[PDB]
Each structure stands twice: as C-alpha cells, then as structure tokens.
Amino acid sequence: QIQLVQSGPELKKPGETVKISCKASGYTFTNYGMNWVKQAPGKGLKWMGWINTNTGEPTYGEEFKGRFAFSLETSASTANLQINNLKNEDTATFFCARGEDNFGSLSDYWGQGTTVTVSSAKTTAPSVYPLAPVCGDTTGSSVTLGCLVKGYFPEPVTLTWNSGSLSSGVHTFPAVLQSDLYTLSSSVTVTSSTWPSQSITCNVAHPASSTKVDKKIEPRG
Amino acid sequence: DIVMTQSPKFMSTSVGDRVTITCKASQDVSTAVVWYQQKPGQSPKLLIYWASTRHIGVPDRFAGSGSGTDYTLTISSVQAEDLALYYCQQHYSPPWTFGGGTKLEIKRADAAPTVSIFPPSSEQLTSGGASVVCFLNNFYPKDINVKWKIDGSERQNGVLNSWTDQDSKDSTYSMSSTLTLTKDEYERHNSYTCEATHKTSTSPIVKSFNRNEC
DSSP: OOEEEEOOOEEEOTTOOEEEEEEEESSOGGGSOEEEEEEETTTEEEEEEEEOTTTOOEEEOGGGBTTEEEEEEGGGTEEEEEEOSOOGGGOEEEEEEEESSTTOSOEEEEOOOEEEEEOOOOOBOOEEEEEOOOOOOSSTTEEEEEEEEEEEBSSOOEEEETTTTBOTTEEEOOOEEETTEEEEEEEEEEETTTTTTSOOEEEEEETTTTEEEEEEOOOOO | OOOEEEOOSEEEEOTTSOEEEEEEESSOOTTOEEEEEEOTTSOEEEEEETTTEEOTTOOTTEEEEEETTEEEEEESSOOGGGOEEEEEEEOSSSSOOBOOOEEEEEOOOOBOOEEEEEOOOHHHHHTTEEEEEEEEEEEBSSOEEEEEEETTEEEOSSEEEEEOOOOTTTOOEEEEEEEEEEHHHHTTOOOEEEEEEETTOSSOEEEEEOOOOO
16 A cells, blocks of 8 residues: 655765655555655654645755755656765664644655765765584584675675575674775575585675675585 | 653563553643554554554453553553563644654563584685684573683674574574684684573573584
C-alpha cells in the first residue's frame, strides 16, 4: 500500500550539493504532505520541516532554514531534499516521512533513509580474503569460517555467503573506519559435513567501485 | 520549544515481562505524545499517538499512558524481536520534538563465547599485509574483554574490534577483533593469541594458533 522509497546513499566532498528523492506510493500525494527528518549518527531523531504537497510551501525547522531546500516533482509523486554547500557535519541519514495531518505532527509511514557521507576521501575498492580455519573444531562438529573485506571507501558493501543461500549462522559485523577506509568481516558456521565437501563462497559487491568478488574459502589446512 | 526528555536510555527485561519506558516534556503537552519504535537497521514505525491510541495494527501489549508532562510506554510479554530504540515525540505545537530514544535489551541467560582465531590469508601476505582475525560468537552478557598476545606479550596496538548489536532471534552478541600487522612483524613472531575474559568463567577463554595440519 504506502511505500516511500528513497534514493541510494551518497558520498560528497565538502562544499557540494545533494538532491535526495522520496518517491511516494499508495496514497494521493496531494492530501498528505512530507516531513523530512535527520537521524544523525549519534544524536537521535530531529524534524527538519514539512512541505505542503498541495500548495508547495515548505516550513523549515530553524536549524535547517538556509542550506536546506525542499521541493517536489508533484507530477511523479516525488518530494526532494536538497542540501547545498555541504558541511562535513551533515553526515547522517535523512528519512522522508509522510505527515498524517496538516504540519506533520504524526509521521505514519516513513521511507527507508538515504545516508550521506560528506568526505574528501576517495573511493577505494575492497580486498576480500577467505579466512579458512587452522581447524580447532569450533563447537561440536561445526566449523566456523570467514571473510575479511578490507580497505574500501565508501560503505556499504554487500556480503552474502553463497548468493544468500547460506543464512543460518552468519554474523556479518559492522564495518569500522580506520582513518580513511573500512574493515568488515563475517563468520559463517557450517557442520563438518557441509565443508570442505560443499563449496562455501563469500560474495562481495562494493557497488561504489563496481567490485563484485567471489572468494571460495579453500580448505587450506 | 517543548523539550522531550527520556531517561533511562538503556533498559533490559527478560522475555515475557513488562518494561515501561518513561518520557517527559518541559511544559504541559496536553496528551499530545506519539511513540515510534525503530527496530535496529530499519525505519521508525508509529506505535501510539495521543499518548494511548495504538495505530493500525500495533498489538495491544504496547500501551501508552501519561498526562501533563509525564508519559510512559509499556510493553507486556516482551518478545525477542521487541529489541529496538523507542522515541517519544510531542505533537501539541510545532516544532515537533522527539525524545532521545531508549534501547530495549532483552535479558537473556549467560552463554559462553565460541572463540575462533584466523591466520593471515596467504593472498593478504602477498600484499605484504598480515591480519590475524578472531571471532567471539554468540556470547551473552555484552561485556567481554579481548586481549591479543603475540609471543606472550600483550599486543595492544593495531586492533579493530567490531560488535553485533543484540540478536533478534536468540538475544546474544558477537564481536570481531582484528589485529593487523606487517608481513615482517608477522614472520618475526610465532604464537598469536586471542584471550577473552567474560562472566561465563574464571579462566580466560583462550584461542591460539600457529599453522598446523588437521
């Protein structure tokens, strides 16, 4: 029924501009205006303003009057956020939310979020390494094995074990940034009957750098 | 403006009991409080508005109450999948102000860590780098201290640790600790250890390696 689907996440060096789209589905655009909310990494949720999708008038929160500009491709049921002269402390996630009423006191139905990472760092493609055990039966007849996806910018990265056919007993850890780039890993635990016998592969796509890697975890023991 | 204040910020209850989050406003907000729930790694969902009116399809176990400046959200039969950040928000005058959130942790019973250490990948070594990886999976409580020791010495430089937020299926945690080294420092040494100290024991859970056949 109602889907607000947002653009994908961008990287932009300080000073640039970004236009984040919010494409609305399921309701009549015109009778429900749009709330733009900023959930900053640590800080929590903040109302950025509301746009009257009927007249087109925006309200900005005082914190947001200035570099921020709401607009709408009415015609296509899109609302957009534009942040000009990007400041480094604008990295965060922005949600368009539908406002139930006049002014948007209620956000029923929120979009997925578009995350911006303001950064002068250059995009780096990752290094994916098959981390196969020097055994030590990791729990009764279970072998744990892993994937270290090192040195990329920016995040996200999509790590699936064997096309996502392996879902049980995966742990993919959050990436961490060491100065300029990211390190991410994921363990998968299979039974001794499933490996080295069956082929476990760690498939890594870094779409910012157009990387898609498939590392077979070779037995190497 | 009206300033919404949430405290505590972290809360724990086991499966099946009640927990009650407190939220408070700076002036009479006249029962205009909304509660969103934001499941880890998802968008907020509207739970309750006008302090008690549950939205379309949020189960009766979630119940809002409150008056004047004091509001509170209660969940009964806490589900494992109820782990999330709860935000309260005033909706009486613009700007709409949100409280800072409160994290619900589900108070599981203790589980010992499945520790696993990993030699440098060979291809990594070709790149001139050596990273020893160590997984400590499905432990509970959150608190675990991991120390590396190379050839006996507490290695404390070059480590990146990462954590899983609590699982929505079995309420445990998981952590990585990656000790990255130079090929040459790796080949200058020989015993590499991931020692973990966690409530489940007296004795440090120890995993060590040096490549040997299985």
